[PDB]
Amino acid sequence: DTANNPLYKEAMVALSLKISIGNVVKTMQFEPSTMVYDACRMIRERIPEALAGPPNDFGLFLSDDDPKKGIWLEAGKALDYYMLRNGDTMEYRKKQRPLKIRMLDGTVKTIMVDDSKTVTDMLMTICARIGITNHDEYSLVRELNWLDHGRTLREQGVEEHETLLLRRKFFYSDQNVDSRDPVQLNLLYVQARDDILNGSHPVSFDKACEFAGFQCQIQFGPHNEQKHKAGFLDLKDFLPKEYVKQKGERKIFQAHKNCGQMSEIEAKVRYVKLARSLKTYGVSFFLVKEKMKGKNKLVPRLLGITKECVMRVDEKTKEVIQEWSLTNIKRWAASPKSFTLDFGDYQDGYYSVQTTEGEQIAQLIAGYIDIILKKKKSK
Structure with a gap:
């Protein structure tokens, strides 16, 4: 006993994909060359469960055992571009x-x-x-x-x-401080402040105490010698981590009382203006190791990237040893071990350094260049 199926169709070219919407899993057939947006339209017209929200909040998603390789299908592409087989599952998933x-x-x-x-x-x-x-x-x-x-x-x-x-992350444009908008002013204060305690903005031990004196005027107001005795302040909240292991509380306090009856708003103005006054403002530092002729073991130094130049800086003194403008840089190349700059005719030889952050150094350079070109389409 054998039987020939009358429903057997020959030369089937369409793709049979299983559409997943929440609990519902229903099989649908698409032509290979169908665009992704037309697929969603077909899914919306044949599955009433896909009409929960507007189409812009939904898309086709290809899941993976690893969540970080799940794919959202681009509407401008076709279906067979994503290498689908019959039996594959496509999610009609919420994008939000x-x-x-x-x-x-x-x-x-x-x-x-x-x-x-x-x-x-x-x-x-x-x-x-x-x-x-x-x-x-x-x-x-x-x-x-x-x-x-x-x-x-x-x-x-x-x-x-x-x-x-x-x-x-980028320091290209800065509207100058005024106290007309106290909320935006506190926004400027917080950003400029936490860049100092984070170590992102290096300062001298003396300037760090002048900042902490202003910040005492912020959070505590005028200096009350009754409540602001020695040992009252957790220094870890008021200085970079390098300057906390020192007897520097009175310097903070003396800078604090130097503010007198200064308003909290006015002290926020001075915190920002002093931060912008430093040459280290707007400079993002990275740790690198260079190879000089002096010896065959890499000496550690810092290089800083600004809105307009790249500079080689000392690890300790934070003085500029050499500075190239971004218009003097012809090429750059990154690696999980190295970073390299080619300056064309403005230097004999490249500038190559061993670093962990060649990833971000290049990403940070291109970003500033991105910004310079963006704010220069039509001046």
């Missing part, structure tokens, strides 16, 4: 996801963001909702450290439960 942002002021706010968009595009919506004009200068870090702007959160292992920090 909550992203906790600890913010600048310190309050943590939850923002919905497109899980398919890159970080450089997510930063646009994040800044638009937090009312921040200069989204080019900002970026995001992880408290366990900047993230790659050209890549999505999913492909960098950022789980959806992790909070991130909005922090300024």
